[PDB]
Write a protein that binds this ligand. Structure first.
Ligand SMILES: Cn1nc(C(F)(F)F)c(-c2ccccc2)c1N
Length: 123
């Protein structure tokens, strides 16, 4: 149907928006601390602590599969990346602090993303 092609155009343009957002976000992690899943080989008890791991590459595969229906779903995964990091690592540590910084940097990128989504009307 033509309505379905309409729906796909919107979802596609949401995806095109989220790609940009994600590309900006990973630029804010030049250490690439958050680029791949935390390694269970290197952190064997990680899953005893973190029930829902997330990382940028896992977000990008969902993105390109157009599995983000809206900006909220995308944000929730971003929050997992940040929050998981802040649970496992203590406040005085360089990991905890990177997540704080990425959360703050990221909040600006996401602030305008929420406005474009609303303005261009994609949900
Ligand atoms: C975002 N994040 N968080 C963690 C940690 F929670 F496991 F410390 C790690 C990690 C720490 C040591 C080895 C491998 C990965 C990363 N990359």
């Amino acid at each position: 149907s033509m309505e379905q092609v309409a729906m796909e155009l919107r979802l596609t343009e949401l995806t095109r928006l989220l790609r940009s957002v994600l590309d900006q976000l990973q630029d804010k992690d030049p250490a690439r601390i958050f680029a791949q899943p935390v390694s269970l080989k290197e952190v064997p008890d990680y899953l005893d602590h973190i029930k829902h791991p997330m990382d940028f590459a896992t977000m990008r595969k969902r993105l390109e599969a157009q599995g983000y229906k809206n900006l909220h779903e995308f944000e929730e995964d971003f929050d997992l990346i940040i929050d998981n990091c802040m649970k496992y690592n203590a406040r005085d540590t360089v990991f905890y602090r990177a997540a704080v910084r990425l959360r703050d940097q990221g909040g600006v990128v996401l602030r305008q993303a929420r406005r474009e989504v609303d303005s261009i009307g994609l949900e």
